[PDB]
């Protein structure tokens, strides 16, 4: 009895502060951890069938003084022999070196290479990155065009899409195209641009796709191998150099609980303990603890740009940085802004964020100015930011990992999607946790507002990664180009699109699964399907009329006059759980729905306070938003906690009513007092073993409805058809009640299975093209000879991701813009681009006139499309046309500073800048339409309209970083 060690929670190492550095060390991907596959082109050449042993030397002959692990070396060994590759792994795998090898190989071989990325920013980061490296690098986005004669070209994918449609000689020279982050083909607005680009590529060229881990990696290679007729290698690894640990932080609780361990194991003992601790500003609680215990840097992902700032506001109290670092924040800040006029440098958004970044707390989202995002990015990599508040947009950002990731929400909700984050959206985010050299492990902290079943939880975290599926559909600008060029048709691309390849590949395994379970719909022989059909059908239809009897009884007009305090009531959950007999205490009328969004029927319009025996360790105070709280019930020999307890119950938990009542003392709130009344409910079962006398729905409660009466008839014929059947009480019943149940439910599988196979034979894709071709006939774009008239070449050069490709093209040779000033064209054109809804001062009636008719001219095409058997809501296809920035783009075009037009409306400063650049690109495109169509007083007015708005802070480039 001295001092000692405890032998319960006791052990050696400290993992609190000093314990996040690796003592083990660096681990490398092994050779057995990688799996190479190779996809081959099909043979319609009968006369010759090639033997393809296509396999890499596993390490390239040429290193180019790159240092390559077994994974990178193998991926690059295919590029060496000039066959395409798909490289798939976590962002941790250093997939960028592979792209650097392709570039190096071309520059040595005196060929040209093209790098693409979905983001304009990432392509700008990859530019100077590569520009520094090889010096031979050019850059082409929608915004900027730098050094196009360059052997290497970093470009955005819609510039590649455009160039494959224009057909310039640039594509003749380029030997290799590298696709970075190819998983964006999933995205529903931008998905088509990707396949189009891929479908439009020359077969002679070669491809490097870079990806996160996807299951159908071979399926992508085969697709590529088919359309472009070449061998496509696949190199895959799941290896992650630094392991992960996922913790859940319950709502309002103090502490987190491990859920997936570093071996990827889901611990349910902890998970159910974590869901148990639920029954806001504790963001700050998390970061506080994360300050002392050493987790830096930490990324915090949320979703609304609006809630992102708020969480950085609540955490601003603490100070995360040393006096030496705060001054370091100061130097880097003043420096990166030097390209700004002192006007801009003092803009309302810049001054406020600087004291925040000084404390080590950052913010990253769409609304921040482009020079702020980059600067804060620059700041984070320099570790001057310990805590960063970001939206989902940030993880796609290239170079910036953390030690810790905190999920604000596990639910992503925009317009109609009420959905769990899916394992794909989880890994791109949660993968940021952990860094090769500096970290022990990745720490991922999930915050949970609401409890969710293990299915929802597990299928997010450890649930198998999502298949990469085609987003392909039809836009107008797509098919107009496809028609025009003689060598090809929109019919052609629709066949070679990834979507149809996918449907084509699924139907063999469907028929296999179908015919496999078509078996048991035969292979189960029920002794007699004849009489079992009658028992199953009667027993099950008996249930439905019984649920309906329970329903009408529950209605307040039928059952309320019997809610005398103290009356016995049988409580049975709608879920089927039967809590037994208890006493009514109070009944309160559920208060009227406020915003209207939560309505309920009359059966749920009351909450009854009723005392029941409950085994629940739940929270008895409130029903939550459920029918009653979450807790079980005692069954036999005093289950865990046999407690007589008052619980709130939605009136639909009413099963029966006892004929008479229990005396209720005024004082019921205490422990022994609650058990006092309960002991009487036991005392009434003394002489009532056959059941407590219930109040007959008709001959007591007085429900005489012709409806209710005729429903009771149907019930007791079904009780008679039950017993008149030989199997009522015969011990082959429960045996054979399993057999039909499988034969019937497999009927549901095979019914549903068949439905899957039907749609997988896709008519819908072609039916849409036809109906659009009908619009294009009547709109004048294509003469019925299926060829394209003047207006169709005009629309071709115009790219809007809305259907305004046609509308704008119409308004152009309606010569709608001809007589305007350049300054006012930017105004009306502003409506066609943006989406974000805006609360503004007003709509000036100088500018209110022209907006009205483009709504009219849109409603023309809108309903004109409807009669073409297309699906379009006529009401607001003019939705897309919005006037809130018209006054704002006017003022800017007039020469007003950026100080003013920010307060012109309620928009984000950085949202504004992205939207004017989106404008001055549409401006560029309208000009080319005029070079194609008609008078260049139209072409050059746009070019003038362009420079009217192309100015100080909007012409601002980038920090190249």
PDB file of N, CA and C in Angstrom, residues 660-689:
ATOM      1  N   UNK A 660     -63.204   1.211 -16.504  1.00  0.00           N
ATOM      2  CA  UNK A 660     -63.253   2.171 -15.391  1.00  0.00           C
ATOM      3  C   UNK A 660     -61.879   2.637 -14.926  1.00  0.00           C
ATOM      4  N   UNK A 661     -61.858   3.454 -13.870  1.00  0.00           N
ATOM      5  CA  UNK A 661     -60.714   4.325 -13.579  1.00  0.00           C
ATOM      6  C   UNK A 661     -59.992   4.130 -12.240  1.00  0.00           C
ATOM      7  N   UNK A 662     -58.764   4.643 -12.188  1.00  0.00           N
ATOM      8  CA  UNK A 662     -57.932   4.611 -10.987  1.00  0.00           C
ATOM      9  C   UNK A 662     -57.928   5.978 -10.306  1.00  0.00           C
ATOM     10  N   UNK A 663     -58.056   5.988  -8.981  1.00  0.00           N
ATOM     11  CA  UNK A 663     -57.958   7.224  -8.211  1.00  0.00           C
ATOM     12  C   UNK A 663     -56.564   7.815  -8.347  1.00  0.00           C
ATOM     13  N   UNK A 664     -56.482   9.078  -8.747  1.00  0.00           N
ATOM     14  CA  UNK A 664     -55.182   9.714  -8.902  1.00  0.00           C
ATOM     15  C   UNK A 664     -54.961  10.803  -7.861  1.00  0.00           C
ATOM     16  N   UNK A 665     -54.023  10.567  -6.934  1.00  0.00           N
ATOM     17  CA  UNK A 665     -53.630  11.619  -5.994  1.00  0.00           C
ATOM     18  C   UNK A 665     -53.042  12.794  -6.764  1.00  0.00           C
ATOM     19  N   UNK A 666     -53.242  14.016  -6.280  1.00  0.00           N
ATOM     20  CA  UNK A 666     -52.737  15.207  -6.963  1.00  0.00           C
ATOM     21  C   UNK A 666     -51.220  15.144  -7.178  1.00  0.00           C
ATOM     22  N   UNK A 667     -50.528  14.492  -6.248  1.00  0.00           N
ATOM     23  CA  UNK A 667     -49.068  14.425  -6.232  1.00  0.00           C
ATOM     24  C   UNK A 667     -48.517  13.158  -6.874  1.00  0.00           C
ATOM     25  N   UNK A 668     -48.046  13.256  -8.113  1.00  0.00           N
ATOM     26  CA  UNK A 668     -47.568  12.067  -8.814  1.00  0.00           C
ATOM     27  C   UNK A 668     -46.111  12.154  -9.259  1.00  0.00           C
ATOM     28  N   UNK A 669     -45.458  13.268  -8.956  1.00  0.00           N
ATOM     29  CA  UNK A 669     -44.171  13.576  -9.577  1.00  0.00           C
ATOM     30  C   UNK A 669     -42.970  12.782  -9.053  1.00  0.00           C
ATOM     31  N   UNK A 670     -43.054  12.224  -7.847  1.00  0.00           N
ATOM     32  CA  UNK A 670     -41.881  11.567  -7.262  1.00  0.00           C
ATOM     33  C   UNK A 670     -41.836  10.062  -7.525  1.00  0.00           C
ATOM     34  N   UNK A 671     -40.700   9.448  -7.195  1.00  0.00           N
ATOM     35  CA  UNK A 671     -40.431   8.037  -7.481  1.00  0.00           C
ATOM     36  C   UNK A 671     -41.479   7.087  -6.903  1.00  0.00           C
ATOM     37  N   UNK A 672     -41.577   7.044  -5.578  1.00  0.00           N
ATOM     38  CA  UNK A 672     -42.514   6.146  -4.907  1.00  0.00           C
ATOM     39  C   UNK A 672     -43.959   6.492  -5.253  1.00  0.00           C
ATOM     40  N   UNK A 673     -44.209   7.772  -5.507  1.00  0.00           N
ATOM     41  CA  UNK A 673     -45.539   8.239  -5.876  1.00  0.00           C
ATOM     42  C   UNK A 673     -45.968   7.679  -7.232  1.00  0.00           C
ATOM     43  N   UNK A 674     -45.039   7.648  -8.185  1.00  0.00           N
ATOM     44  CA  UNK A 674     -45.319   7.091  -9.508  1.00  0.00           C
ATOM     45  C   UNK A 674     -45.591   5.594  -9.436  1.00  0.00           C
ATOM     46  N   UNK A 675     -44.944   4.926  -8.487  1.00  0.00           N
ATOM     47  CA  UNK A 675     -45.091   3.485  -8.339  1.00  0.00           C
ATOM     48  C   UNK A 675     -46.367   3.140  -7.575  1.00  0.00           C
ATOM     49  N   UNK A 676     -46.905   4.116  -6.850  1.00  0.00           N
ATOM     50  CA  UNK A 676     -48.127   3.919  -6.089  1.00  0.00           C
ATOM     51  C   UNK A 676     -49.326   3.578  -6.955  1.00  0.00           C
ATOM     52  N   UNK A 677     -49.519   4.350  -8.020  1.00  0.00           N
ATOM     53  CA  UNK A 677     -50.629   4.134  -8.943  1.00  0.00           C
ATOM     54  C   UNK A 677     -50.423   2.856  -9.751  1.00  0.00           C
ATOM     55  N   UNK A 678     -49.174   2.594 -10.121  1.00  0.00           N
ATOM     56  CA  UNK A 678     -48.834   1.401 -10.873  1.00  0.00           C
ATOM     57  C   UNK A 678     -49.182   0.122 -10.136  1.00  0.00           C
ATOM     58  N   UNK A 679     -48.912   0.101  -8.833  1.00  0.00           N
ATOM     59  CA  UNK A 679     -49.212  -1.060  -7.998  1.00  0.00           C
ATOM     60  C   UNK A 679     -50.711  -1.360  -7.961  1.00  0.00           C
ATOM     61  N   UNK A 680     -51.522  -0.360  -8.294  1.00  0.00           N
ATOM     62  CA  UNK A 680     -52.964  -0.550  -8.402  1.00  0.00           C
ATOM     63  C   UNK A 680     -53.310  -1.220  -9.729  1.00  0.00           C
ATOM     64  N   UNK A 681     -52.583  -0.848 -10.779  1.00  0.00           N
ATOM     65  CA  UNK A 681     -52.747  -1.448 -12.101  1.00  0.00           C
ATOM     66  C   UNK A 681     -52.327  -2.917 -12.068  1.00  0.00           C
ATOM     67  N   UNK A 682     -51.500  -3.269 -11.091  1.00  0.00           N
ATOM     68  CA  UNK A 682     -51.171  -4.668 -10.879  1.00  0.00           C
ATOM     69  C   UNK A 682     -52.277  -5.314 -10.060  1.00  0.00           C
ATOM     70  N   UNK A 683     -52.857  -4.528  -9.159  1.00  0.00           N
ATOM     71  CA  UNK A 683     -53.902  -5.014  -8.270  1.00  0.00           C
ATOM     72  C   UNK A 683     -55.211  -5.260  -9.018  1.00  0.00           C
ATOM     73  N   UNK A 684     -55.365  -4.643 -10.187  1.00  0.00           N
ATOM     74  CA  UNK A 684     -56.574  -4.841 -10.980  1.00  0.00           C
ATOM     75  C   UNK A 684     -56.453  -6.117 -11.814  1.00  0.00           C
ATOM     76  N   UNK A 685     -55.220  -6.576 -12.008  1.00  0.00           N
ATOM     77  CA  UNK A 685     -54.982  -7.806 -12.751  1.00  0.00           C
ATOM     78  C   UNK A 685     -55.123  -9.011 -11.828  1.00  0.00           C
ATOM     79  N   UNK A 686     -55.362  -8.735 -10.548  1.00  0.00           N
ATOM     80  CA  UNK A 686     -55.575  -9.773  -9.545  1.00  0.00           C
ATOM     81  C   UNK A 686     -56.760 -10.659  -9.916  1.00  0.00           C
ATOM     82  N   UNK A 687     -57.908 -10.033 -10.155  1.00  0.00           N
ATOM     83  CA  UNK A 687     -59.120 -10.770 -10.494  1.00  0.00           C
ATOM     84  C   UNK A 687     -59.455 -10.687 -11.983  1.00  0.00           C
ATOM     85  N   UNK A 688     -58.548 -10.128 -12.776  1.00  0.00           N
ATOM     86  CA  UNK A 688     -58.761 -10.062 -14.220  1.00  0.00           C
ATOM     87  C   UNK A 688     -57.598 -10.658 -15.012  1.00  0.00           C
ATOM     88  N   UNK A 689     -57.519 -12.000 -15.050  1.00  0.00           N
ATOM     89  CA  UNK A 689     -56.477 -12.725 -15.783  1.00  0.00           C
ATOM     90  C   UNK A 689     -56.821 -12.875 -17.262  1.00  0.00           C
TER      91      UNK A 689
END
